[PDB]
Amino acid sequence: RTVSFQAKESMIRRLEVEAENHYWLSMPYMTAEQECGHAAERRAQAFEAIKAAATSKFPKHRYIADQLDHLNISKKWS
């Protein structure tokens, strides 16, 4: 199977896109040490939201109006 002309170009185009991806990942704004702890607070709060919803499950309230409203099915014009 000889490889087509169009097939060869499309691979090259993708390779160039990834080649640039190498360049932009080579200049970290922060070093490994400076990174430590800069996002601690946001992470801590996010889990608290996760736990709060998980531990808040409970049955729903029941109202008399729901049960009594069924009688309206026999509502009429006098």
Binding site: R1, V3, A7, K8, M11, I12, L15
Partner: protein, 161 residues
């Protein structure tokens, strides 16, 4: 036995093929590089001296075409000429050109073209040369110089008398 490659691998091979650098102009079409200084082999310098020696030694130099006669028959001519103390000389023409270009003899260049033989001696037995030439009829004489005087065959015949 070749095993078929995955198409993705085959695509990788196709795009990574070697590409040679291409010159804009062919080197042949371009002017040819100048020749470096040449080396004289130990054939022209030694033979150059031989050409110098024969001209210095022999006062008369007469030129005749090579006849491509059998060497077994060249011998008898050489032996016959040796009995008359007249010698034969043969040299490559191309290395003979530079001296003949710049020497006492410069109008003999047309004579020194192609296969040729040289009549060299110390005595002007020019009449006997015809007798030695008459021994073999078909051999012709082209001309040359006798006693340092350049002349043609017809003039040589008159000079012989």
């Amino acid at each position: 036995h070749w095993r078929v490659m995955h198409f993705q691998r085959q695509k990788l091979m196709a795009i990574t093929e070697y590409i040679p650098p291409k010159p804009a102009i062919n080197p042949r079409c371009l002017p040819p590089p100048p020749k470096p200084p040449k080396e004289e082999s130990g054939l022209v310098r030694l033979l150059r001296q031989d050409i110098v020696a024969v001209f210095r030694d022999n006062r008369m130099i007469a030129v005749c075409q090579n006849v491509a006669l059998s060497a077994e028959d060249k011998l008898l001519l050489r032996h016959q000429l040796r009995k008359h103390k007249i010698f034969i000389k043969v040299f490559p023409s191309q290395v003979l050109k530079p001296f003949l270009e710049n020497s006492k003899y410069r109008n003999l260049l047309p004579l020194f073209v192609g296969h040729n033989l040289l009549l060299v001696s110390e005595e002007p037995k020019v009449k006997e040369m015809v007798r030695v030439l008459k021994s073999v009829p078909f051999l012709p004489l082209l001309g040359g110089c006798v006693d340092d005087t350049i002349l043609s065959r017809q003039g040589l015949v008159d000079y012989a008398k």
